[PDB]
Amino acid sequence: KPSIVILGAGYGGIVAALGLQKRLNYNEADITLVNKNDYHYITTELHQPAAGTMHHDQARVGIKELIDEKKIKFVKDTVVAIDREQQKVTLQNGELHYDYLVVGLGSEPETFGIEGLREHAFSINSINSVRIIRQHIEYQFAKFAAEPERTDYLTIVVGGAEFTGIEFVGELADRMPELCAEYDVDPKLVRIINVEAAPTVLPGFDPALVNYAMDVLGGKGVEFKIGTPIKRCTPEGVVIEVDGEEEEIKAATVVWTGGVRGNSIVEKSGFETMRGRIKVDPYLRAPGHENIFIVGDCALIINEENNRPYPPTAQIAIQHGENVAANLAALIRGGSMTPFKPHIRGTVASLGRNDAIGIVGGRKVYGHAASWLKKLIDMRYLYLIGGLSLVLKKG
Amino acid sequence: KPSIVILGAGYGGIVAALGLQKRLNYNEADITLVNKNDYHYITTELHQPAAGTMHHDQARVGIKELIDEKKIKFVKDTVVAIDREQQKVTLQNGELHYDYLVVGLGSEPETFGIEGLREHAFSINSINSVRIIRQHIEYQFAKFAAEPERTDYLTIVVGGAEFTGIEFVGELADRMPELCAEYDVDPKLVRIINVEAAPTVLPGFDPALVNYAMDVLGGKGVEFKIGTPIKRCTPEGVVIEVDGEEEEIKAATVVWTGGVRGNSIVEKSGFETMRGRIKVDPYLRAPGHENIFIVGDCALIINEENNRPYPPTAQIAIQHGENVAANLAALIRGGSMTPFKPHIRGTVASLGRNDAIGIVGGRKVYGHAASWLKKLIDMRYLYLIGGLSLVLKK
Ligand SMILES: Cc1cc2nc3c(=O)[nH]c(=O)nc-3n(C[C@H](O)[C@H](O)[C@H](O)COP(=O)(O)OP(=O)(O)OC[C@H]3O[C@@H](n4cnc5c(N)ncnc54)[C@H](O)[C@@H]3O)c2cc1C
């Protein structure tokens, strides 16, 4: 038999595994799915638990429930490195050998060599992380009542005004009243600050949506510093440059949404990467390797319409997964492989549980309609991986 | 005038103010009650929020509801100092003058000058404090899944196996399943440690009850280090001396139930204090001062029947309150006042929602019945201070 190894159980990994599961009958191939955890988590919702608006359990599902144990063998371990030449993968407590390999380890934060960011800041990239963020913030608010001289406890800074950062501050803003009610804090003293290097909030968005969003969040007490870059980060706070002069913000909680790069494991294993990602062939496989397929954030692709790269998104990762499943199933059988054609719909961004901005159907949706739309789109994924039972289990 | 000032709205203080209000007709005297916070909190329940077993809002009640504006005037500020000679009290945002004074600012943690205890440890003495403790523990558990190498995060050390410490570890133990369930932590790796200098846990109680309690908590995964004293404290953990050698415990959370002393203001105000507390006359009044009365944890008293001192407790503080109310009313009226004789009921200690130990009525009650007994006794105070509305609201 031929042995297929899939790394990571993220969007690309899980869609690939489930697809392979559907395509192949028993004994056609040996399939192993490797993930750091026994669960796969819905990354797109991760902002919600981080704020504390939603329980983290909604964002994750157990892998054992998702798959057939006869078809796939599941491994709970951490990837340390990949060796192409030896054709083996090295894990913390194991090693594997693959006839065919699928790589979807997701992304790692991009700090752009900003001083102290990696050490002293938080990121929304996992269940553990959002848990830590949420309880961190709750802890500081708990601490405020003891010494109210220290208003830094109430200050929360988000780095980057890109998609993730804006969703997160929206959730935080919606979260704030209940939190202050819990910890006996005057709502006025709380500061939520969004700091972006770029001159505009939400680049890659129609200005109409952006200003509407700024009206909503600004109405909710959010503060925006734009054209302002983070000079450095310290346990005390952050230091930013305005009008070519240094200014210091003393904040207990600093969260970094500014940028993302591919997993370090990919670059560290001798691949060549632009921004940590690999520019793959029309069949989504690494250049010079017929036996390795790449998906999600680790993969790089460019649009025909403009010589600019497709952004790293859940949706494109899903498409990657289905395509790779099809191609692998065909390839082991000696069949013809299909090239990858990306079909891209529009994305909706939440401004809290009740509010959103989006471009869907080439239309400019706002408010409740946009929010409900986003929820429906997200439900479509749940239907995809787990079906009616999975969707019903949420709500 | 005559002007009466009460400091703090703890058990003694609030019972005192309520007592005066019940006792006196309108316009008879000027009474002002001062507290750092707009609420009075049921200290007796404070261990529960610290574990996270019970929401904190239950443990506190707003003061304004309790008293009648016209009878009493409330000031929300923090006492900074007392000047006996000038007969004045100094606050952060005010100053007050008293014909008669009542002091019940409660207690402050006693660390016995142990290195780093005040800096690096937690105490269960206020709502804010228990909130900080609870969220601290939750924070460590949240941190754990990211790095499971660090088991110190899961370790919680409690100093003292006295009444408070035992209740607290009991609550933590009952708390543990839900807590471990939330943050993806194996229940086994969790350590709860109770550390006492004394050779026995829970001194001053009949040994049978003690053995039963150790059986319960020990069954619940609680660990006891007895005859072992804490040498010093670090943010990483604590250092204790066992078998004539230093031993290092790596624990993220250290909670101190070991000792209590009177409020620092008392020592700082020119009083003469044994353990930061004052030894009062039979009328519950400060020595050398006819216009000053002391209540609660700030007060010190001795039993004739046994040459041992009365401990600082809620119930005795309440008795202080009623006594001071009656005596004060007499003093304003010019009548003869009653000396203070304390009558003591039995005390019950919880081991969680499902278990308790008590010596109420000399029956030495154990288990579930004891728990219900404690709940009823706790309800009695609520009935006293607020009436039907307060008890129903819980
Ligand atoms: C708040 C937030 C909101 C978002 N909303 C949207 C949206 O609305 N629409 C949209 O299209 N996109 C959205 N995205 C982007 C989208 O979520 C990501 O692009 C997508 O998750 C990436 O797909 P992936 O499977 O390759 O990465 P991942 O989902 O991160 O896959 C990583 C998986 O592999 C595991 N893993 C990682 N490293 C290792 C390792 N060394 N060893 C073993 N296992 C490892 C991880 O535990 C995880 O299981 C959002 C992102 C964020 C942070």
Ligand SMILES: Cc1cc2nc3c(=O)[nH]c(=O)nc-3n(C[C@H](O)[C@H](O)[C@H](O)COP(=O)(O)OP(=O)(O)OC[C@H]3O[C@@H](n4cnc5c(N)ncnc54)[C@H](O)[C@@H]3O)c2cc1C
């Ligand atoms: C976990 C715990 C459990 C307990 N369980 C029991 C039990 O089961 N049975 C029993 O009999 N006793 C029990 N006790 C003891 C009892 O709760 C205390 O002894 C009681 O508080 C004594 O009355 P107090 O008014 O002096 O204390 P406090 O209630 O603490 O009075 C202090 C009040 O004054 C305020 N204050 C303090 N300093 C200032 C300042 N400078 N300026 C203005 N305001 C100030 C405080 O905020 C507080 O409101 C327990 C104590 C603890 C910590």
